Design a protein around this ligand. Structure first.
Ligand SMILES: CC(=O)N[C@H]1[C@H](OCCN=[N+]=[N-])O[C@H](CO)[C@@H](O)[C@@H]1O[C@@H]1O[C@H](CO)[C@H](O)[C@H](O[C@]2(C(=O)O)C[C@H](O)[C@@H](NC(C)=O)[C@H]([C@H](O)[C@H](O)COC(C)=O)O2)[C@H]1O
Ligand SMILES: CC(=O)N[C@H]1[C@H](OCCN=[N+]=[N-])O[C@H](CO)[C@@H](O)[C@@H]1O[C@@H]1O[C@H](CO)[C@H](O)[C@H](O[C@]2(C(=O)O)C[C@H](O)[C@@H](NC(C)=O)[C@H]([C@H](O)[C@H](O)COC(C)=O)O2)[C@H]1O
Ligand SMILES: CC(=O)N[C@H]1[C@H](OCCN=[N+]=[N-])O[C@H](CO)[C@@H](O)[C@@H]1O[C@@H]1O[C@H](CO)[C@H](O)[C@H](O[C@]2(C(=O)O)C[C@H](O)[C@@H](NC(C)=O)[C@H]([C@H](O)[C@H](O)COC(C)=O)O2)[C@H]1O
Ligand SMILES: *[C@@H]1O[C@H](CO)[C@@H](O[C@@H]2O[C@H](CO)[C@@H](O)[C@H](O)[C@H]2NC(C)=O)[C@H](O)[C@H]1NC(C)=O
Ligand SMILES: *[C@@H]1O[C@H](CO)[C@@H](O[C@@H]2O[C@H](CO)[C@@H](O)[C@H](O)[C@H]2NC(C)=O)[C@H](O)[C@H]1NC(C)=O
Ligand SMILES: *[C@@H]1O[C@H](CO)[C@@H](O[C@@H]2O[C@H](CO)[C@@H](O)[C@H](O)[C@H]2NC(C)=O)[C@H](O)[C@H]1NC(C)=O
Ligand SMILES: *[C@@H]1O[C@H](CO)[C@@H](O[C@@H]2O[C@H](CO)[C@@H](O)[C@H](O)[C@H]2NC(C)=O)[C@H](O)[C@H]1NC(C)=O
Ligand SMILES: *[C@@H]1O[C@H](CO)[C@@H](O[C@@H]2O[C@H](CO)[C@@H](O)[C@H](O)[C@H]2NC(C)=O)[C@H](O)[C@H]1NC(C)=O
Ligand SMILES: *[C@@H]1O[C@H](CO)[C@@H](O)[C@H](O)[C@H]1NC(C)=O
Lengths: 424, 149, 149, 424, 149, 424
């Protein structure tokens, strides 16, 4: 008698091919899968990142931790002071808090800005501070993108030529003036007969500041905006001008009406505009209309040793106050910037404006020891190489790829029977 | 027809591993049973399936570093990278399937070998998973000893 | 020497699959035929060769997306990319060759198994593709029944 | 008796190695091969491309389809009008057809330009229109490279300061003038005694035009070229100048002889030069010599949402007319531009200059539903990953790689024998 | 237990290939020797190990062209490229190990086959690397002829 | 009796897994390894590289080969002359050797510079020649990075407007002057009463020079530096200026004190500064203070057909002379530049300053027929794809990757036993 083990399959079995042997099975299981994506901020390296912020990340606030959007351990990684903002420290308006932001970190989190919003009501002849705000943070984010560190430079070496010029003040600016730019004026120019002499100045952007190397500086090269040569001649003789030159003499900024058309709004009166520019370290010249001279007195110092795309966190008030979205728009138009945004209003635990449940959820990733990828879609762990939907850029780290679930191969499971040769 | 072949069956009828016997009266007429105590095969399948985790973990742990500053998705590039990774996963799959196949087939050979040495040398191998038994000095309790059904 | 070995021959002399027989008078002197009706092998080879198309189509369908705005060929980079793809094709080749080898060898085992059950158990296996037959109750029409040459 | 299947090989058999088993065979067959390359234009995505053209792709021409270099279905994808060209619409010379080119497509085909060649004989004080043509299309192709869409902007908002200045005309320009730039002149300046005042103007490049977003504008900032200050003083007092400034006052174009040497050709008389520049949206200033003011009045609007390398098709007349190769040279020096060129003369089916057999062969790819790669060498289907010779850049899509035929591995075929173990 | 199985031993005790024998008096009690003249196995292992050089040389000869003008190491990118190459080397390794395994196992089968035809058909195969011998017309010089220990 | 081959393993055996069969073994051997890295200079393609040098690579030197840091075959690949340097040929100071460096090679080796170090004691009103040296080689290396070839252009077409101006000389410059720039002066300007007219000039950067295509030119746009407008008025009326304009009139260099502050060092007297700039071919204008005009008269011509990162070799004297490290610092701050530096002093075999054992070791790679990768860490052969430590950039060729030795997989060796199935 011939006795045999017999191998047989059903219509329920499908054949899976192999390099060196096939397999019949009824069930299959996918070989791998998608990695969850979590919205909000995080870091891939806990020992090389830095945060810059305000009360909402300030562990020294009287109401900590209720006033905080991050736990203690994350707050220790921030450089923050209640009431502060990068922009407030750039200009230093009268009576505002003036924090010296500085630090180093390849990954960077910017979570401030709200402390100079329209709610602040800072005037000082500002044409449109929201516009200035957007321009300013754009330059910061651009420079931060390629820098390892950042520091406020709280005082530039400056020198003016006039010996009669005195420090300028205005009732629109709390009856004084910004820390930067400085405002120098000669009391005598008077378009009667007295017309004074063209004013001159230099300012130096240092090659370093403390322990921080400077390869690049963000500065504002402000100019006044008058209604028209005539309204201007209410104050100065001839045409208004305030020109900025590098050491060789190339014009780099300012407003020279003598070639450029006037662009002021009717009967608004005098306005000041402060575009920000990225300049190399060095000494720079200024030439201006005799009566009024503006001189940059601060900067932010960056290096070019490199960094990762940055994270910028929405910085807005609760509903009752007047906010802006200038840092959002700064971030959107600047390459290498990732923006973190709430979907619900800011409702603080401490008071109205500090300690928000959603923001705490969004910032909790800052947070983790196992984040491998950070993107404009959120952050991921190192589970699999795939995600269900694209991780939107900017992004960095070990970042997953989108593939259709159907393109993920399967493996036989359940009852299994081998097959090889042609069996015929 | 004995471990070198897989046969198909229609309608209902269980798939899997069965005992099959042949001639007798001249000429006989076949017979195929309804399962044995192939407990080894079940456990072996379990072990072999769990052993695939090693190859999958190797693949899952490999994620390319990237850095993009750009604000708009480079979709065609993203898709190409995925397609390449899916291709690699496809090779690994084909390797794993053959690895299961070959190691199961070998586990089946080791089952059949234990049966050969169990009635040895009453058994007499006729290729893997098949035996010729002399019905004259192996009765029925003999056959049930050797094959256990 | 029976399906575990491949031998070489010189000058003319056909390569391939043949029937070979041994002793007889004590001591015998060998003999190797001139083909059988190994029709299965021919058809199997055909099927196995056609089955390689699946692995080749997988490879041919994979072409990386690219975008170059540059006006002069980046030759070194182009060559490196090609070299990498040729390397991958080389692995796939080695996989395909072994896959053919293993599945042909198995088809050969399945041929030999049919011969064993054809004269069973007159045949008696001596490793794959070899048998011991008792020339006393298998004459010549018996042997020609079992092996067909 | 021992009876065995015996396996044997000849000197004609070669051994092919495998991972898990070798194979003897007499024949081999290559595993894969090269994909044919077809010369001419094509697209990888039929639902995201656009063509810009002239009579040769205009389905409304009286002689269609005999006057066409493409079939109906492709012509429907073009924005074309008989007698038109991008350059003609840029300047709008008297009596020429003035088509408003506009559309969107990641892949772009430029097949026009011939309608303003030397054959046209447009004068209008042109120094060298062929030079202008080359400069103009260079800017177009550069901007088109990174844009999804393009549109003519057929009228810029402009404003001049003079109240006495009137519209300028010349017998060299059909006794009128271009649509762009505008020519403004004061009849009184007369170097007797009358010398007038410096002229001023502004022109605005919009942030959008219809449904089209503008991130960039191609414009011409023209200036006149006089023989020498003296020949100039035939017309104006002092030195000629026509300067272009952005909103802040930075010089961006024009000709200021007061610092720059004169560069006119002897006794040729006055010439006009019109270099094209790529400018951001905004408002721009002009200052010029009192008698003659030039003001840009048109532009081409592009976005920066991205696009593929473009295809530019040779746009020349049949042998009897006077052609140029300015769009060829524009394309060659501009990154991301692919040029399509005939090897035989243009011989039209409709008339001499429309409906060419070779061009129809070259444009037929526009055409196909199965093109996966487009390159400066031609286009390919998705047959294999290899080509016999390099696909020259620019190129995009699933593009084949060059490899030597000898580096393509083979597979055993014909009679085959397996081998494993050492067999010894 | 005969070429389909590998057994473990404790403390001292040599690992490797040995001759093992079974019953005798009813019931017997086993015995495992202390090496044979398995000279084939030693030489085969040598050949198989040297044959791996082909696959390694293929890998070693493949180095991607690169060009970097940058002054500071892009470390994360460098590490990712290495990690990818190490992954490929890992697949090749797994291929090579199985290739050795399968070709050694086959060389072992070819050894056992020579032993079968050496005492044929006194030997009688009981799965690969095992035989049933009738102690009645194979004495001891017979067994030592066939198995050589 | 049952007789069996029995397979058994020890605690000394470890199991190695395979796709299709496992292997027991006692020993393992690593599958591959690291490729040695050799410090110094080399090339990946012997038929496409060029060297530029001095006596130390000059096969025509009287003391060759004792005065050489390379063997004959490598010296034949250099363009060198004893006593020469790129910088010396740029300016052509009185009595210095003036070699016309020119050649083509995708790989480039710069091994000269030492012949104009502080040891040379060239004065010629130089503010800081070491500074000039660093600026000059920076421009060279930058341009060389993307060029296939380089040539000195030993004479620019120049034209000055003044008919009274004469060639300038000074006792600080061997009682003559540089070849470049040219110095033109009018004897009459005298701030008594005589004040002369603004000087003018043009210089042309050619589109080619001999067989060499020029896409880019390195030139110096020099200007004088006076102590203060007053010390300046020792010489000229009004403010000093020397301005450089392109053909359209855009300022591109010079020193215009009229807007820029003075930057001279007290009582040092007049100094000359010569920053180098990369300019396109064309004709350029100069406007200057009446008394003194400087005009560029030489350049280095480069193309933009592409090249590899360059190698710059430390070019310093033996200890007894006064050296500088300007070419080192030029190379470090310039992308695509690889610097080769000795660790011991230069001790020459011929004399003190030519034929150094260490430099010969470092340059011997130039040298080899089997270098596949060149990097800031040294060069490698094509042994394996790995190195023990990173190859620092810049780098090019088939360059090895760093991996930990532990991540290199092993293969079983020694006594080996196969395993398959579950064996249970
Ligand atoms: C009060 C005065 O002198 N002039 C009126 C002036 O018109 C008077 C007509 N005389 N004439 N001819 O017209 C302007 C607009 O019509 C008025 O602003 C001006 O009155 C201003 O009153 C405001 C309060 O609303 C201020 O007091 C301003 O005076 C200051 C100031 O802004 O506080 C006094 C500051 O000390 C002075 N400081 C400096 C450094 O200049 C400041 C400043 O000059 C002006 O604002 C100039 O503004 C700029 C930046 O151009 O004015 C009175 O001008
Ligand atoms: C006719 C005239 O007024 N002047 C002669 C002028 O020399 C005469 C000497 N008098 N003085 N002293 O010299 C120039 C060159 O020697 C001649 O071109 C000019 O005669 C021109 O005749 C041509 C025909 O060949 C034209 O008629 C031109 O007159 C126009 C024109 O070009 O059509 C008349 C236009 O109305 C006028 N339009 C405007 C808006 O200015 C146009 C134009 O001024 C001039 O071409 C200026 O050209 C530019 C752009 O600078 O001239 C007569 O000039
Ligand atoms: C000698 C002379 O004319 N002037 C003194 C001049 O002060 C004299 C006061 N008179 N007043 N009024 O002051 C300067 C600094 O106090 C002295 O340099 C100058 O004396 C110089 O003597 C030096 C030697 O130390 C030179 O001879 C220099 O004369 C030359 C020169 O440098 O060789 C003569 C050259 O021919 C002349 N060449 C040209 C083309 O100008 C050269 C040159 O002008 C000046 O150096 C100007 O330098 C520049 C580039 O601005 O001077 C005497 O000046
Ligand atoms: C083909 O064979 C398989 C198993 O031989 C059958 O699978 C069983 O089906 C029932 C209900 O579907 C399950 O409860 C059992 O668990 C399955 N078997 C196993 C191995 O677990 C299958 O139903 C058969 N198909 C047909 C068409 O009859
Ligand atoms: C080695 O063997 C093969 C086949 O055994 C021989 O191949 C045959 O050769 C003739 C003419 O070359 C062909 O017409 C046949 O079709 C081939 N056989 C097959 C399998 O199709 C080959 O000629 C032999 N070589 C030598 C050296 O004798
Ligand atoms: C798998 O191992 C086998 C056996 O070691 C290799 O077969 C050898 O291949 C070369 C050709 O490269 C022949 O010259 C040798 O004679 C073969 N040896 C034997 C014993 O047949 C085979 O190359 C390996 N597979 C791969 C793809 O590397
Ligand atoms: C396990 O078995 C192996 C070999 O069967 C033993 O290896 C031998 O050990 C000695 C000294 O260590 C060497 O001189 C021999 O060369 C080794 N054998 C071989 C194959 O060359 C090993 O010692 C055993 N281990 C234990 C724990 O006893
Ligand atoms: C192929 O499958 C076999 C069997 O499932 C795997 O062998 C196992 O390997 C691990 C080591 O990774 C051992 O610890 C297990 O005991 C092995 N199981 C058996 C039954 O031997 C093998 O890993 C797989 N091959 C690869 C390369 O993944
Ligand atoms: C062993 O490998 C090398 C290749 O590294 C080969 O050249 C040599 O001939 C091989 N030895 C044998 C006996 O095959």
């Amino acid at each position: 008698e011939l006795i045999c083990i017999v191998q047989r399959v059903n219509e329920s079995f499908s054949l899976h091919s192999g390099f060196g042997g096939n397999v019949y099975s009824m069930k299959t299981e996918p070989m791998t899968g998608f990695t969850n994506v979590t919205k909000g901020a995080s870091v891939i390296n806990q020992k090389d990142w830095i945060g810059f912020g305000d009360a909402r990340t300030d562990l020294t606030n009287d109401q900590f931790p209720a006033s905080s959007d991050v736990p203690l351990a994350v707050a220790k990684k921030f450089r923050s002071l209640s009431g502060a903002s990068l922009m407030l420290s750039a200009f230093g308006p009268p009576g505002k808090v003036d924090y010296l932001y500085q630090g180093c970190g390849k990954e960077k989190v910017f979570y401030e800005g709200v402390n100079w919003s329209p709610e602040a009501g800072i005037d000082c002849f500002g044409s449109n501070w929201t516009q200035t705000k957007k321009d300013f943070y754009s330059r910061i984010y651009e420079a931060a993108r390629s820098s390892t560190c950042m520091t406020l430079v709280n005082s530039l070496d400056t020198k003016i030529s006039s010996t009669t010029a005195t420090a300028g003040t205005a009732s629109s600016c709390s009856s004084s003036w910004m820390k930067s730019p400085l405002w120098y004026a000669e009391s005598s120019v008077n378009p009667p007969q007295v017309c004074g002499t063209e004013q001159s100045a230099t300012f130096t952007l240092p090659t370093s500041f403390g322990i921080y190397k400077c390869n690049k500086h963000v500065v504002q090269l402000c100019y006044f905006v008058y209604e028209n040569k005539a309204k201007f001649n209410t104050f100065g003789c001839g045409d208004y001008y305030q020109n900025y030159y590098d050491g060789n003499g190339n014009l780099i900024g300012g407003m020279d009406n003598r070639v450029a058309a006037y662009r002021g709004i009717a009967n608004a009166g005098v306005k000041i505009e402060c575009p920000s520019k990225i300049l190399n370290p060095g000494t720079y010249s200024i030439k201006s209309t005799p009566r009024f001279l503006l001189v940059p007195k601060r900067s932010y110092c960056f290096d070019t040793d490199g960094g990762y795309p940055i994270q910028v966190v929405q910085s807005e008030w609760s509903a009752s106050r007047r906010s802006d979205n200038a840092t959002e728009e700064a971030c959107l138009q600047t390459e290498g910037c990732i923006f973190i945004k709430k979907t619900t209003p800011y409702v603080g635990e401490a008071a109205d404006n500090a300690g928000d449940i959603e923001m705490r959820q969004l910032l909790s990733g800052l947070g983790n020891n196992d984040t491998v990828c950070v993107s404009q879609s959120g952050y991921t762990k190192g589970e699999t190489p795939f995600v269900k939907d694209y991780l939107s850029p900017p992004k960095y780290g070990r970042c997953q790829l989108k593939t259709d679930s159907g393109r993920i191969p399967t493996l036989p499971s359940g009852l299994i029977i081998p097959q090889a040769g042609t069996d015929s | 027809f004995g471990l070198l072949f897989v046969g198909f069956v229609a309608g209902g009828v269980a798939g899997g591993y069965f005992w099959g016997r042949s001639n007798g009266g001249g000429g006989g007429a076949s017979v195929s049973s309804t399962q044995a105590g192939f407990d080894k095969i079940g456990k072996d399948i379990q072990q072999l399936r769990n052993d695939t985790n090693a190859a999958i973990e190797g693949f899952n742990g490999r994620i390319a570093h990237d850095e993009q500053a750009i604000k708009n998705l480079a979709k065609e590039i993203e898709d190409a990278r995925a397609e390449a990774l899916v291709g690699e996963l496809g090779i690994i799959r084909s390797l794993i399937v053959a690895n299961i196949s070959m190691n199961l087939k070998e586990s089946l050979y080791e089952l059949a070998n234990q049966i050969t040495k169990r009635g040895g040398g009453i058994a007499q191998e006729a290729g893997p998973g098949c035996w010729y038994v002399d019905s004259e000095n192996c009765d029925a309790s003999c056959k049930e000893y050797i094959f256990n059904f």
